[PDB]
Amino acid sequence: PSSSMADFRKFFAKAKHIVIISGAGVSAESGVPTFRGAGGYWRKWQAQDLATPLAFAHNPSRVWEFYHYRREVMGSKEPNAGHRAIAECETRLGKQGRRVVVITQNIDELHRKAGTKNLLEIHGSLFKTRCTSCGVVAENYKSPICPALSGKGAPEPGTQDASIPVEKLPRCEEAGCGGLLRPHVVWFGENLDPAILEEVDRELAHCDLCLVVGTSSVVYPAAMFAPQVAARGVPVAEFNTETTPATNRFRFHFQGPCGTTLPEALA
């Protein structure tokens, strides 16, 4: 693919419907542990080990420890220059009658914290719960999410399983439900929300410009989103520290932290 910014900036100068798809690179640049590999571990596991309905079924305490860690750690993280540039870009192009939509794979809400409005969080949120009994989805920023998790979730291996009994894990507070809560996060082996997918479809169908920022394009179906946009001929710009299995299907490929390239690229 090209690495010519002047040429990217041509299309960008005129684009009316920009779709910006983001992945864990963008969060990593804020200091958010994304447990992707080849050295993204929590104790002895990575996301694909613990972010699964099987992991949750067999050890709900350990999965809760993991997401508890990840919730707490966010207290000190801020959005980075890439987040801000995306958010200001939206605000600016907005005024000019031009559309910017963010489609994120990330569950950390940094795009929201930065000021992004048109945000599709296709894999859910660290700060939302769903009740496994009644299905209610609720925002939850509570630190700690429950008393029994106070002081738990330490990432060092060797760390002992808290083994909270399920009664003392996060429970639904809807009168007379009592159900066990889970993170409102799309796990491996689960479906994305079809209502969210239809939105994403509408956005990809109607876009004239597409950016794919800090994604390693190995997570499906999100990995198909940008290639689909390049398949109607629409230019896709990959912003990434590395090349990916998707790279040669795109128009551009800008190397480096999204924090460095995006503020230039979306000025």
Binding site: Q48, N191, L197, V218, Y220, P221
Partner: peptide
Amino acid sequence: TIMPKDIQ
């Protein structure tokens, strides 16, 4: 036909 969330 769309598949569940997977790592390839």
